[PDB]
Design brief:
Chain lengths: ~290, ~575, ~575, ~290
């Protein structure tokens, strides 16, 4: 049970801004996601002393610097695996990972299935700009094949992957998508992801104007399509149909939400069935080794 | 005067070779004897030749010994695998008549004792009780206490019913009777029982897991790998009892990542692995050093390089443990000698990670992992526990505050007024990225001076032997220490001018203590099981000693006679 | 007589700081001069302070030099960033009047030259032409060839239309006129133009990619990482022209994995990375060693440890390159000095991986990666190319056949009668797993003797200086070699008894050649940019030299005067 | 384009056996899969000089030792990444990866998406026994939670993953499943996987009687359900429905098969559009660097 929520009264988004100046390019989509993060934290009345933001490497991954909380800046692709250890060690914390499409699904792609499958109680905000921004413009697993980039000057020789479909297939128990140009949409879906008990994933399109010249704001605005209100967010099959983009349109809103035991809850059940506690008489364990 | 007896039992795994040895070991411990065991499982899981060797003595044991005094073959393959060691003077028990082989010419001087183990078990309509027959014969022939042996069998089979137990005791008695009918011509007898000591029997990997728990372990993450998985098995069973959690990660990178995340959250955390896993962990161990986050990795070394020889003996991960990080990225490196160390030095490892906020690697090996020993029963209150330095809450918190002892107070998330960043980028006192020349020089000195100050606090480099000048000094590490200990007993009994030193802190190294030892020796020999002489390399690089490397690299440990012979070659 | 001139230009990236420097470098090369450049991009992608430093000379250049002779500031931030180096004797060009800053008291002895770059560019209604005005002024004040500068500008802007080019040439002329109106009081002039030489200008990372292609590269896999990504960029553009393939993998483990698979398939394969990536590759480089599969990794070293200082200067991956594998797991390790080496030593790297069927690591660094030099135009037919020993098809093929030279003939898939397995398990001659002691000893000797025989074939350790006894010998590696080259020019011009040695084969090391050098020097100093003195460590471990380490670790390279001063401190 | 097929006359399964005795446990399901491999190779008339078997670590991963062909025994989890390099380097070869559930989806789980997404022309035969056999009985990403194993003596604290659904989501262009007890089903599906141009994945249930006491032969026989003949193997959505096990029954047969460009084909297009070839005048590249 996360103890960071509803501990502060009359909070405003600016109360969660750190003193660190934001160094992203002008027009970078990551600004809209940062604004959504601020709004979510204020709407939850969060005491950020109980909030742990963990990121790897990338332009996206610099976002915790701009948020007033505890944070760890770790290695490229490892934020989610690190966050699993933080979360399991301290289930009272609100644990959030932020990172980009390369950090998450290239080098970090092997850790993604197990976080979701084990239903770790954390939030993963993936800022999808269809490129590697921080390393100055190589293509990513979400890049379109017609894009040319610095290691693919002749186009991408493969198709992109589907992050929402991956996460649904992996078993994420809260799956949503938004566009950074709608920061209030980001805030609502990020807020719901934090309160959700289980692995909550929010894929947010974010423009990189400096290096990605085809996945522009106008492209993302035209690409998205809000999810109809009659969609059943407990229907996994319907969520996967949405993730596959009917008519070629990317869904925005909440695709899927279900209640299932979390990893820390299952680990606690193990300790409970043993009567485990910190004061346990370790002589009982030692005695098992007597000849 | 011979105080020990070495009994090797070998045959088809699945006929109870391993359980038979464990029964003998437990019985000898209940009779007040010291015990040192080793075993090899079948090469393939489906089965095949397995081996168990139990050494029992009225005095302390430090290794497996040179070779067996008594050999018991359950089948012909076991006889062939050990034929060259069945030498005149040894006792040889074998499955006859009714076994699966005709024994070759048993050399004259070998005391042979045929016992129909297989057929006797068949007459009882229970071939799986074959090992019970062998135990009876061995007990009778070589004075393994029948009283404590039946206690051990009763503890195992009493839970199955008085019929099952009385059945296995009859098979035992049948084997005892068969051996009594033979005339004992060999001089080998297990020492007579003594007052039973307050001991336990533990394998190396279980002892590492227990040492972790006794050191205050709260979070364990691992990925299975031979020969380290039994650590996770033991922790998984017992750590939840103490309020901690074990998680099996998807690989070694995930495991060390979770260890760092749990440690950042304020929990004492560790993993266990072997060479391949430690190599995968190199990048994240750099993060531990740079971010000053406590973590402990136990590397149960196996045969390398690459996939290597997973089941064999080798201590060849010292290069990787010390130099495996990119940049200037030091680790604190320890290495254990015996089962006692597997407990206390895993506590040491957790303590040093707490005190110095640094990655600690403890090097074990695949023989120690499965060897068992009688050790004095551990009492939790006998272990000193160290906790990470925490912020006193005064002033403004700076995660990487520059202090006189170079150790910055830590603060777990949730601590009021201690929001901060832990980071792998080079950084200033507040953890903000900082690429200036002066700061990099300053922070290198902070982290290096911090970790190097282990030398002022943790001393674990015992010296034994002659007090004055020695003709030969021996320096070794790992479980090879135990082999050299027995060699020193033999050499010092002959009045030879020899001394020995047993580094268990491997990095950083106590150079002055190395130099003082070397100044009192005409020669220094360094036996170790790796191809390059890895400890000798660091002795050459960091000390004034010019060592003579004695390297072997064939998947086997040294024996005491190997050490004795090499030392005598260097005196005369 | 001063033959070189060092010009630093600095200001807002986006006003053409880098492009201006590249224009001067190209113009000086077209005027028959030698050129050495370095640059820093803005710390953030969005922009900020950028710096370019171009050195041009009538004689060969080996490093950036001590500090600039001429500094050209486009704005006040650039002036503040470099104010402490604007010392008496230097020339100072700056945007004034009409710029964004009022300069403080220009120190006495500084030759100051205000040029209204911004105001002139604004009066022309094209602020982006500001750098053209600066170029005109610098050309006039310091004799940068107007002819070749306008040639270079014409090549860049002629494709944009006759109006655009004539506009930029007009801005250039305005800057020339502004400078002509000032009185030149400083002694600085670029050397007079000479006949253009048969040269190219290349950056270090591009030169690595070209060397791979010239060495017969067929398959490249990498993952982007600073400061190595330009290698993959160059290869991705040009390797498909030569029939090869580049793939961007999902991480460094996948990249080195794909390299090994392509190499097993019979193709010359390589990757490029930096410290963090090399640490992730440690396990797979163990497989390359054990299975004897050729592979090449270029590590463009950056600031460590951990995430470290990605954009700064450091040579601290020597420990990881040599000792990064678990078990006894040796690599062949080279390190480049300059742009020439980036070509020829990447060819060397592929050739040695072919010849010795072993993992080769080439250590570059982040300064060299972005530095450009005039180098002699490479001629493809002048490079010796080595191909892996391939089976002649006679007899029976065994992948790990024991031969006199320890190199087993290879066979690519599809070769009739040469079906075989490459494996990371310890193995016998046919590649079947083999855990016996004699075989492990035998195969260690095979693979170690093989890789160690590089010493008999590849020699790359130049010695220069006095022929007889020296008061001081200097040993260094990496791009630090070039710095010591210039220091040696100064020390020998002062008649000092000094000599220097430049190892470019780092492992295995040619111990006898080290011992022969050191025996002729009273003292041996080893300058390197890492905290622990990593080369000195191996010099102590493997030779009879005990060096005096001169270590710095602040993200900056050495300068010649630092080496000169350190050497003079040691001469009595 | 693989050149190994239909090159040899009168080939029998035993012609593809090596001399290495197969030392798997009696009753191990891996035997049925190995027999299927031999039969597929003989029915295809394969020239095994042009056949490359690549594996990682595990009981399953020992398979290449038993095959008379070119082969590599590489590192745990890295076989598919190694095989990509082999395949791209030599697109004429028949490249087959064999491995277990842990080798493939635990440590190897990060390489799986990119092989399938890029449609590398290779076959991946995954021998799913619901456990780590070679390391002596720890649970795997396909283990059922009620199983106890040596690191989970109190049960598995998470749900298993769905290999078929993963691979369909990843973009595998040939997806099939079988039971090792049906060696003719194994042979036909593996043979079709080899002939398929693209990334072909065959998940085969395999009993481990030594350590897995609940995923028995009888359990797998009752679990499987043959795919109806009217199933449309070009319908990705319908294939995903089958993979999610309607009625709790695991489908056996061919779930999905589609024709799309392979990685080596797209890489070749890049070279063809440049006129690239081995004899290219490298002086043209060098000339671009002239001042
Ligand atoms: C082990 C390792 N490999 C490679 C890198 C280089 N690297 C840093 S960020 C990055 C990718 C950034 O892309 P993304 O995650 O999409 O974030 P973005 O910058 O686009 O927001 C890479 C490849 C690294 N830091 N570490
Ligand atoms: C880097 C590394 N980590 C861990 C291991 C240990 N290991 C060998 S096989 C294996 C898993 C075997 O399970 P699976 O892949 O399902 O094959 P199976 O034996 O069940 O057929 C593991 C964890 C290793 N060899 N290397
Ligand atoms: S490079 Fe792209 S992702 Fe990075 S800050 Fe600039 S616009 Fe944003
Ligand atoms: S342990 Fe299991 S998977 Fe391995 S050979 Fe035996 S039955 Fe097969
Ligand atoms: Mg991105
Ligand atoms: Mg398995």
């Amino acid at each position: 049970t996360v103890e960071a929520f509803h501990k502060m009264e009359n909070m405003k988004p600016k109360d969660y801004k750190s003193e660190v100046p934001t160094t992203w390019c002008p027009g970078c989509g990551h600004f809209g996601i940062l604004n959504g993060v601020y709004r979510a934290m204020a709407e939850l009345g969060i005491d950020s002393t109980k909030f742990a933001a963990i990121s790897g490497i990338g332009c996206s991954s610099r976002m915790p610097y701009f948020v007033d909380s505890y944070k760890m800046h770790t290695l490229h692709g490892r934020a989610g695996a690190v966050a699993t250890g933080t979360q399991v060690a301290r289930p009272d914390l609100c644990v959030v990972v932020a990172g980009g499409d390369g950090d998450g699904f290239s080098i970090g792609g092997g850790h993604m299935p197990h976080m979701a499958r084990k239903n770790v109680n954390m939030t993963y905000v993936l800022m999808d700009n269809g490129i590697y921004g921080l390393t100055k413009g190589q293509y990513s697993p979400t890049s379109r094949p017609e894009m040319t980039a610095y290691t693919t000057p002749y186009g991408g020789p493969e198709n992109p992957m589907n992050p929402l479909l991956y996460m649904l297939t992996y078993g994420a128990t809260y799956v949503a998508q938004a566009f950074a140009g709608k920061p209030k949409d980001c805030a609502e879906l990020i807020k719901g992801a934090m309160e959700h008990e289980g692995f909550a994933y929010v894929n947010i399109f974010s423009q990189c104007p400096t290096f990605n010249k085809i996945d522009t704001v106008d492209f993302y605005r035209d690409l998205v399509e809000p999810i109809p209100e009659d969609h059943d967010t407990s229907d996994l099959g319907a969520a996967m149909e949405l993730a596959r983009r009917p008519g070629g349109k990317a869904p925005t809103g909440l695709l899927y939400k279900t209640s299932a035991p979390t990893l820390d809850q299952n680990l606690a059940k193990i300790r409970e069935r043993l009567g485990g506690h910190v004061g346990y008489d370790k002589n009982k364990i030692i005695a098992l080794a007597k000849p | 005067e011979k105080k020990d007896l070495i009994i090797r039992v070998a045959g088809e795994g699945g006929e109870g070779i391993i359980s038979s040895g464990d029964f003998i070991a437990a019985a000898c411990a209940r009779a007040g004897l010291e015990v040192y065991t080793f075993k090899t499982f079948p090469a393939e899981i489906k089965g095949g030749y397995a081996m168990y060797q139990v050494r029992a003595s009225s005095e302390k044991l430090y290794c497996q010994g040179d070779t067996f005094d008594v050999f018991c073959a359950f089948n012909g393959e076991a006889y062939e695998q050990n034929k060259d060691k069945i030498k005149p003077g040894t006792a040889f028990v074998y499955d006859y008549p009714g076994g699966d082989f005709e024994p070759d010419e048993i050399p004259e001087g070998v005391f042979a004792y045929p016992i129909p183990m297989s057929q006797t078990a068949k007459e009882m309509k229970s071939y799986r009780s074959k090992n019970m027959v062998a135990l009876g014969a061995l007990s009778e022939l070589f004075n393994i206490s029948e009283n404590t042996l039946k206690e051990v069998l009763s503890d195992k089979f009493g839970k199955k019913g008085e019929e099952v137990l009385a059945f296995n005791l009859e098979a035992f008695d049948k084997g005892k009777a068969l051996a009594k009918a033979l005339t004992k011509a060999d001089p080998f007898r297990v020492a007579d029982p003594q007052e039973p000591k307050d001991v336990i029997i533990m394998a190396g990997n279980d002892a590492v897991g227990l040492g972790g728990i006794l050191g205050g372990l709260e979070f364990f993450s691992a990925y299975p790998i031979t020969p380290a998985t039994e650590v996770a098995k033991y922790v998984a069973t017992h750590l939840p009892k103490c309020g901690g959690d074990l998680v099996q990660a998807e690989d070694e990178i995930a495991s060390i990542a979770q260890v760092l995340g749990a440690s950042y959250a304020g929990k004492k955390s560790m993993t266990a692995t072997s060479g391949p896993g430690l190599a995968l962990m190199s990048e994240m161990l750099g993060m531990a050093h740079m971010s000053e986050t406590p973590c402990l990795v136990v590397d149960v070394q196996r045969g390398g390089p690459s996939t290597g020889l997973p089941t064999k003996h080798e201590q060849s991960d010292l290069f990787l443990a010390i130099h495996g990080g990119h940049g200037d990225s030091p680790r604190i490196v320890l290495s254990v000698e015996d089962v006692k160390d597997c407990i206390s030095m895993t506590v040491d490892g957790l303590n040093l990670a707490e005190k110095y906020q640094a990655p600690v690697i403890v090097l074990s090996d695949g023989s120690l992992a499965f060897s068992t020993q009688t050790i004095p029963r551990p009492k939790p209150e006998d272990f000193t526990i160290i906790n990470r330095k925490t912020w006193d809450g005064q002033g403004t918190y700076k995660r990487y505050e520059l202090t006189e002892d170079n150790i910055s107070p830590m603060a777990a998330p949730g601590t009021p007024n201690a929001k901060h960043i832990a980071t792998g980028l080079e950084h200033g006192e507040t953890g903000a990225p900082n690429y200036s020349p002066a700061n990099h020089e300053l922070m290198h000195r902070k982290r290096f001076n911090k970790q190097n100050s282990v030398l002022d606090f943790y001393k674990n480099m015992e010296v034994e032997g002659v007090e004055g000048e020695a003709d030969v000094g021996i320096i070794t590490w790992g479980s090879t220490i135990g082999v050299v200990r027995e060699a020193m007993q033999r050499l010092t009994a002959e009045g030879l001018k020899v001394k020995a030193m047993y580094p268990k802190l491997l990095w950083p190294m106590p150079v002055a203590d190395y130099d003082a030892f070397g100044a009192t020796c005409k020669k220094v020999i360094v036996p170790e099981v790796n191809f390059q002489g890895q400890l000798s390399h660091f002795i050459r690089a960091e000390t004034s000693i010019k060592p003579i490397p004695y390297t072997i690299c064939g998947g086997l440990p040294f024996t005491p006679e190997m050490i004795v012979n090499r030392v005598k070659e260097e005196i005369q």
